């Protein structure tokens, strides 16, 4: 409630332009090349060009000596994959808020987000969060990322990873820093022609925000009732996505036969994808896609939420199938068939959409017969040596990381894959 009283800045995109939130007004100039995303406008693309810059100029009524020894900053961040050895030992600037090298600044590197003072005697102080590209799959490498950095010129400057401490320096340590009436959002001294960074909801407090504060601000801009796709955008219908089971992610949907006398199940190892030096990393763009079709949802965009009831089609070879089960089978384990959509009669198939119950979960799919009731949510069984794909009310009862916990993978410039 008083987050929004401490805010001196809030970029938002609201009728056909950028727009500051706070009470402030502050004057916001686009260059020729920035992006804006159909689907999410928010979201803010910036590529490494002159032209692809945000320049900020804050009223002097609010630009005061001392106005950052106590103030905070938040905006989410979404990195594309390093592939070029050019991007090694290549930091550069994407905020900047300095005059005469002095002032405070993020920045970018190989695996790094990085925050910076600079008193006007070029004594730095930095907070850093580091990701590797050396892992199987990645919280960070090209998924939204929440940033946020608070500071008290007494104490430490800190940086939080979707509000969570990451890294804390003192800085009581340093002279006097320029207090610039401007920020620049501009990829400074990039030396990979390709980068590019995506960010939205860029604020500035003017205070130290809590870990509360902090946590809160976090689930808030989090939309925990609209599902998200593995990069953290919104999830949505007509859309293709490669699956990656969270339980066993060194596997990759496959159908061995469609029909009823088929079933879908994980298959085994996944390829890798690398470049050397630069990254390794299981390939996700493998396996049967899966394609979210509407039942019962009336809104009219086509964004995923809580509790939509969906059909999920299939494809296999350039064909969509239905995801249905016949419930009548014995066990508590439904075995999950791709059929052809005439041929689904009154076999299961609806499916409840869950991204939370208030407590969010990873388990996506809660399948229903047709009379209302709970089938199971969708995961798999170990059947000898095969994991097949199956609806369990085993899983809606323990509802930690289950076999139901799932990941809809689209093809996004962000991450690139190439066999052979
Ligand atoms: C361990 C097991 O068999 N779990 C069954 C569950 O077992 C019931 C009791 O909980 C068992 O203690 C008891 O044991 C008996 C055997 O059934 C019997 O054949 C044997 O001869 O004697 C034992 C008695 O000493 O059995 C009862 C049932 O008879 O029964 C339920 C039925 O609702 C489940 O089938 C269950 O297996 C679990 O099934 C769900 C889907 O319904 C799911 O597949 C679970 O699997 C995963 C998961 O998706 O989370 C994935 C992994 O394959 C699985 N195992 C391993 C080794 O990694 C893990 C873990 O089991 C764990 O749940 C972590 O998530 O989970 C699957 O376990």
Redesign the pocket.
Known sequence: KNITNASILSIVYKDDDLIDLSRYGAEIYNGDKVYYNSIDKNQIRLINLESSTIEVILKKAIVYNSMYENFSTSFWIRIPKYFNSISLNNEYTIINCMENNSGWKVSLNYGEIIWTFQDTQEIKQRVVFKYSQMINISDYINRWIFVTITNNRITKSKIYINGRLIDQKPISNLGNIHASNKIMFKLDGCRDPHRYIVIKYFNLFDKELSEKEIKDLYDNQSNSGILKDFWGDYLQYDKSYYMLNL?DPNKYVDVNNVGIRGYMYLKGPRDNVMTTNIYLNSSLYMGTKFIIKKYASGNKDNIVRNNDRVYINVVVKNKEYRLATNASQAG??KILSALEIPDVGNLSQVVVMKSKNGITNKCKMNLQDNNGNDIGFI????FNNI?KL?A?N??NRQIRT???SWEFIPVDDGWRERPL
């Open positions: 339980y508590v384990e995961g798999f069984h170990q994991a199956v369990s085993w899983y289950l076999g139901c």
